[PDB]
Design an enzyme around this catalytic site. Structure first.
Site, PDB file in Angstrom:
ATOM      1  N   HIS A  61      25.823 -20.328 -65.934  1.00 56.96           N
ATOM      2  CA  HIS A  61      24.704 -20.640 -65.034  1.00 56.96           C
ATOM      3  C   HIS A  61      23.357 -20.597 -65.723  1.00 56.96           C
ATOM      4  O   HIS A  61      22.380 -20.923 -65.109  1.00 56.96           O
ATOM      5  CB  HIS A  61      24.762 -19.762 -63.870  1.00 56.96           C
ATOM      6  CG  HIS A  61      24.744 -18.402 -64.293  1.00 56.96           C
ATOM      7  ND1 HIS A  61      25.835 -17.655 -64.524  1.00 56.96           N
ATOM      8  CD2 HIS A  61      23.630 -17.585 -64.481  1.00 56.96           C
ATOM      9  CE1 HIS A  61      25.470 -16.430 -64.856  1.00 56.96           C
ATOM     10  NE2 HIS A  61      24.107 -16.368 -64.854  1.00 56.96           N
TER      11      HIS A  61
ATOM     12  N   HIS B  33      16.341 -14.785 -70.452  1.00 56.07           N
ATOM     13  CA  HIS B  33      16.926 -16.029 -70.014  1.00 56.07           C
ATOM     14  C   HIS B  33      15.880 -16.771 -69.201  1.00 56.07           C
ATOM     15  O   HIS B  33      14.789 -16.249 -68.931  1.00 56.07           O
ATOM     16  CB  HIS B  33      18.191 -15.810 -69.193  1.00 56.07           C
ATOM     17  CG  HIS B  33      17.916 -15.069 -67.913  1.00 56.07           C
ATOM     18  ND1 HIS B  33      17.839 -13.703 -67.823  1.00 56.07           N
ATOM     19  CD2 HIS B  33      17.593 -15.530 -66.667  1.00 56.07           C
ATOM     20  CE1 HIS B  33      17.501 -13.385 -66.590  1.00 56.07           C
ATOM     21  NE2 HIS B  33      17.326 -14.460 -65.845  1.00 56.07           N
TER      22      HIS B  33
ATOM     23  N   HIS C 175      15.246 -19.852 -65.831  1.00 55.59           N
ATOM     24  CA  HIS C 175      15.660 -20.700 -64.728  1.00 55.59           C
ATOM     25  C   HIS C 175      14.802 -21.950 -64.795  1.00 55.59           C
ATOM     26  O   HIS C 175      13.621 -21.851 -65.124  1.00 55.59           O
ATOM     27  CB  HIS C 175      15.433 -19.994 -63.348  1.00 55.59           C
ATOM     28  CG  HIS C 175      16.122 -18.684 -63.299  1.00 55.59           C
ATOM     29  ND1 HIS C 175      17.319 -18.472 -62.716  1.00 55.59           N
ATOM     30  CD2 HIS C 175      15.769 -17.448 -63.789  1.00 55.59           C
ATOM     31  CE1 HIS C 175      17.671 -17.188 -62.856  1.00 55.59           C
ATOM     32  NE2 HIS C 175      16.750 -16.536 -63.510  1.00 55.59           N
TER      33      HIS C 175
ATOM     34  N   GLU D 121      11.770 -19.454 -59.816  1.00 52.41           N
ATOM     35  CA  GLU D 121      12.336 -18.662 -58.745  1.00 52.41           C
ATOM     36  C   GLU D 121      11.226 -18.101 -57.869  1.00 52.41           C
ATOM     37  O   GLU D 121      11.132 -18.383 -56.679  1.00 52.41           O
ATOM     38  CB  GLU D 121      13.247 -17.572 -59.331  1.00 52.41           C
ATOM     39  CG  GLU D 121      14.353 -18.170 -60.177  1.00 52.41           C
ATOM     40  CD  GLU D 121      15.605 -17.319 -60.118  1.00 52.41           C
ATOM     41  OE1 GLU D 121      15.561 -16.174 -60.638  1.00 52.41           O
ATOM     42  OE2 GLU D 121      16.607 -17.791 -59.545  1.00 52.41           O
TER      43      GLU D 121
ATOM     44  N   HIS E  85      12.691 -14.785 -67.706  1.00 49.69           N
ATOM     45  CA  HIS E  85      12.967 -13.416 -67.305  1.00 49.69           C
ATOM     46  C   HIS E  85      13.363 -12.603 -68.507  1.00 49.69           C
ATOM     47  O   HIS E  85      14.391 -12.917 -69.149  1.00 49.69           O
ATOM     48  CB  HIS E  85      14.110 -13.405 -66.294  1.00 49.69           C
ATOM     49  CG  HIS E  85      13.711 -13.979 -64.955  1.00 49.69           C
ATOM     50  ND1 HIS E  85      14.614 -14.391 -64.002  1.00 49.69           N
ATOM     51  CD2 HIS E  85      12.453 -14.168 -64.466  1.00 49.69           C
ATOM     52  CE1 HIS E  85      13.894 -14.817 -62.973  1.00 49.69           C
ATOM     53  NE2 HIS E  85      12.601 -14.670 -63.218  1.00 49.69           N
TER      54      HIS E  85
ATOM     55  N   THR F 219      18.370 -12.020 -58.985  1.00 49.85           N
ATOM     56  CA  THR F 219      18.203 -13.270 -58.252  1.00 49.85           C
ATOM     57  C   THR F 219      19.457 -14.117 -58.135  1.00 49.85           C
ATOM     58  O   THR F 219      19.384 -15.216 -57.553  1.00 49.85           O
ATOM     59  CB  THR F 219      17.081 -14.109 -58.822  1.00 49.85           C
ATOM     60  OG1 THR F 219      17.510 -14.509 -60.133  1.00 49.85           O
ATOM     61  CG2 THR F 219      15.746 -13.388 -58.865  1.00 49.85           C
TER      62      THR F 219
HETATM   63  N1  LIG Z   1      17.549 -13.399 -62.786  1.00 53.32           N
HETATM   64  S1  LIG Z   1      17.540 -11.853 -63.006  1.00 53.32           S
HETATM   65  O1  LIG Z   1      16.724 -11.510 -64.120  1.00 53.32           O
HETATM   66  O2  LIG Z   1      17.366 -11.121 -61.774  1.00 53.32           O
HETATM   67  C1  LIG Z   1      19.243 -11.433 -63.486  1.00 53.32           C
HETATM   68  C2  LIG Z   1      20.254 -11.633 -62.561  1.00 53.32           C
HETATM   69  F1  LIG Z   1      19.981 -12.167 -61.380  1.00 53.32           F
HETATM   70  C3  LIG Z   1      21.560 -11.311 -62.849  1.00 53.32           C
HETATM   71  F2  LIG Z   1      22.445 -11.473 -61.865  1.00 53.32           F
HETATM   72  C4  LIG Z   1      21.931 -10.847 -64.112  1.00 53.32           C
HETATM   73  S2  LIG Z   1      23.664 -10.490 -64.341  1.00 53.32           S
HETATM   74  O3  LIG Z   1      23.909 -10.283 -65.739  1.00 53.32           O
HETATM   75  O4  LIG Z   1      24.016  -9.440 -63.368  1.00 53.32           O
HETATM   76  C5  LIG Z   1      24.520 -11.872 -63.842  1.00 53.32           C
HETATM   77  C6  LIG Z   1      24.394 -12.953 -64.926  1.00 53.32           C
HETATM   78  O5  LIG Z   1      23.073 -13.348 -65.304  1.00 53.32           O
HETATM   79  C7  LIG Z   1      20.961 -10.632 -65.072  1.00 53.32           C
HETATM   80  N2  LIG Z   1      21.202 -10.214 -66.397  1.00 53.32           N
HETATM   81  C8  LIG Z   1      20.695  -8.896 -66.765  1.00 53.32           C
HETATM   82  C9  LIG Z   1      21.499  -7.778 -66.152  1.00 53.32           C
HETATM   83  C10 LIG Z   1      22.754  -7.445 -66.653  1.00 53.32           C
HETATM   84  C11 LIG Z   1      23.510  -6.467 -66.024  1.00 53.32           C
HETATM   85  C12 LIG Z   1      23.039  -5.811 -64.929  1.00 53.32           C
HETATM   86  C13 LIG Z   1      21.771  -6.129 -64.393  1.00 53.32           C
HETATM   87  C14 LIG Z   1      21.029  -7.096 -65.005  1.00 53.32           C
HETATM   88  C15 LIG Z   1      19.609 -10.912 -64.724  1.00 53.32           C
HETATM   89  F3  LIG Z   1      18.701 -10.677 -65.665  1.00 53.32           F
HETATM   90 ZN   LIG Z   2      16.604 -14.598 -63.996  1.00 51.38          ZN
END
Ligand SMILES: NS(=O)(=O)c1c(F)c(F)c(S(=O)(=O)CCO)c(NCc2ccccc2)c1F
Ligand SMILES: [Zn+2]
Ligand SMILES: NS(=O)(=O)c1c(F)c(F)c(S(=O)(=O)CCO)c(NCc2ccccc2)c1F
Length: 258
Positions: A62, A92, A94, A104, A117, A196
């Site tokens: 994604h 990463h 979006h 976002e 992010h 998100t």
């Molecule tokens: N967009 S965001 O920065 O809020 C985000 C996510 F929404 C998110 F679901 C993840 S994830 O790894 O859980 C799912 C795949 O992207 C990460 N990555 C950082 C992260 C890793 C583990 C736990 C919490 C955050 C993450 F960074």
């Molecule tokens: Zn993100």
């Protein structure tokens, strides 16, 4: 029939597998600039990336993730709204199918072309996995991208993408300096929110910089050549991997400036 960004699995569907999608502190949100209140008690964010050690870039299906060494206390984020030290581990983006959408968070309903992010975990929880189970476990620094002049510090990311076109591909990505992705000003908005996309955990202090960075059309266009699918599967361009703004509910957005 896993979650994604399409009609058949996108943001409106996520609540079935992840009911917190309808929670009290979901992200992103629209940042109403006139309603966000300057908070003179906030601190001037400390972003200390000099020792950051990038490792790898990975197509996660994604998005793509640039991963760092988070085994010793290197690159960290502190100050602002934060109590304690948060360790950088990944960044990463979006982005949209069109320059007019992709972020976002929104600013008075404005959409940017993309949003960066930079994710950090609170070192007081020991691991990322532990941190993600806490309401103050993560701090994500969000930076808007507009299309205009190129961002030099982004080009190394853009150029490696052809090597990780499809889901599950990775490439070495050492010696990348994320300081080259930051705007001049650290003025920011902050609020308590969530991841998100699934699993949507309510573990994030969001820090969204006011100042965008400029990237070129050609840079963002290369992000749009990535694929959501794995090699050998039908091609689906990786575009529009953003969740729309969610209800603010019982929250206040606080400004570091003005
Ligand atoms: N967009 S965001 O920065 O809020 C985000 C996510 F929404 C998110 F679901 C993840 S994830 O790894 O859980 C799912 C795949 O992207 C990460 N990555 C950082 C992260 C890793 C583990 C736990 C919490 C955050 C993450 F960074
Ligand atoms: Zn993100
Ligand atoms: N690229 S990243 O560093 O943000 C990342 C993920 F994107 C991610 F999805 C995961 S995951 O394990 O939750 C699901 C795999 O898609 C981890 N996991 C890191 C981790 C887990 C437990 C304790 C410490 C770190 C993770 F570290």
């Amino acid at each position: 029939h896993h979650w994604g960004y399409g009609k058949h699995n996108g943001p409106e569907h996520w609540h079935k597998d992840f009911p917190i999608a309808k929670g009290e502190r979901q992200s992103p949100v629209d940042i109403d600039t006139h309603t966000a209140k300057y908070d003179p008690s906030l601190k001037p964010l400390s972003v200390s990336y000099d020792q950051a050690t990038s490792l790898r870039i990975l197509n996660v299906g994604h998005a793509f993730h640039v991963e760092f060494d988070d085994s010793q206390d290197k690159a960290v984020l502190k100050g602002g709204p934060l109590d304690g030290t948060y360790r950088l581990f990944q960044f990463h983006f979006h982005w949209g199918s069109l320059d007019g959408q992709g972020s976002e968070h929104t600013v008075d309903k404005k959409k940017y072309a993309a949003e960066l992010h930079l994710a950090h975990w609170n070192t007081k929880y020991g691991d990322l996995g532990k941190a993600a189970q806490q309401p103050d476990g993560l701090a994500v620094l969000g930076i808007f991208l507009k299309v205009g002049s190129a961002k030099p510090g982004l080009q190394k990311v853009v150029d490696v993408l052809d090597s990780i076109k499809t889901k599950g591909k990775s490439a070495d990505f050492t010696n990348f300096d994320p300081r080259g992705l930051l705007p001049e000003s650290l003025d920011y908005w902050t609020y308590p929110g969530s991841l998100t996309h699934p699993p949507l955990y309510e573990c994030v202090t969001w820090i969204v910089l006011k100042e965008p960075i400029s990237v070129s059309s050609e840079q963002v266009l290369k992000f749009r050549k990535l694929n959501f699918n794995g090699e050998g599967e039908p091609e689906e361009l990786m575009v529009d991997n953003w969740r729309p703004a969610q209800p603010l509910k019982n929250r206040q957005i606080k400004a570091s400036f003005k």
